[PDB]
């Protein structure tokens, strides 16, 4: 049945539980100082450079102190990436925004 | 100056420190239970799904019983994918591989 039906929450669960098994692994690896070896096994040079830049796209989207030129040129975030990062900020919790504001902009 | 030249080890260091920010950020996110929503910001649902699935690719190479056609029908993974898997495992440190051969092989 479920593979014929137009949506299956059993497979949404099966995928979430594939994902949480990854998140537990990484939550322990930090609790054993194995997190950077793990992360280099799990994320590619390009993925890693993209997550480091993502910290900077989101920092700035909380600082609110860049133009469109400056994000296109200095961080490589065009209209599209900004739209999807701005959407994802909106989709987040307030306790997420509030705490990223307490870590990223408290360093200035 | 380094821009002009064939290799920059300064852009390498900048990108490494830009990357190690992400990895201190997410160390402190587990300690607040903000890792779920932080990971949902930093990662598209097809990345989160690749991370989910990448754990089984690392489990099923470390257990060594699945064939190349079994990994292609059940995990999606090509020759390319398993090759890049097996180059990543050979280059992992032994204390990571011994700890993976616990964490993914101690549950069954």
Curated annotation (Swiss-Prot), chains A, B:
Pfam families: Trp_repressor (PF01371). Its main location: cytoplasm. Residues 68-91 bind DNA. InterPro entries: Trp_repress, Trp_repress_bac, Trp_repressor/repl_initiator, TrpR-like_sf. It is found in: Cytoplasm. One of its GO terms (cellular component) is cytoplasm. It comes from the Bacteria. GO terms for molecular function: DNA-binding transcription factor activity; nucleic acid binding; sequence-specific DNA binding. GO terms for biological process: negative regulation of DNA-templated transcription. Gene3D superfamilies: TrpR-like (1.10.1270.10). Keywords: Cytoplasm, DNA-binding, Repressor, Transcription, Transcription regulation. Signal peptide: none annotated. NCBIfam families: TrpR. PANTHER family: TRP OPERON REPRESSOR (PTHR38025:SF1). This protein is an aporepressor. When complexed with L-tryptophan it binds the operator region of the trp operon (5'-ACTAGT-'3') and prevents the initiation of transcription. The complex also regulates trp repressor biosynthesis by binding to its regulatory region. Belongs to the TrpR family. HAMAP family: Trp_repressor. Homodimer. This is Trp operon repressor. The gene is trpR.
């Amino acid at each position: 049945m479920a593979q014929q039906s137009p949506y299956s929450a059993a497979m949404a669960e099966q995928r979430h539980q594939e994902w949480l098994r990854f998140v537990d692994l990484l939550k322990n690896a930090y609790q054993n100082d194995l997190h950077l070896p793990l992360l280099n096994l799990m994320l590619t040079p390009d993925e890693r450079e993209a997550l480091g830049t993502r910290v900077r796209i989101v920092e700035e989207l909380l600082r609110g102190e860049m133009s469109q030129r400056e994000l296109k040129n200095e961080l490589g975030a065009g209209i599209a990436t900004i739209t999807r990062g701005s959407n994802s900020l909106k989709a987040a919790p307030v306790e997420l925004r509030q705490w990223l504001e307490e870590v990223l902009l408290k360093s200035d």
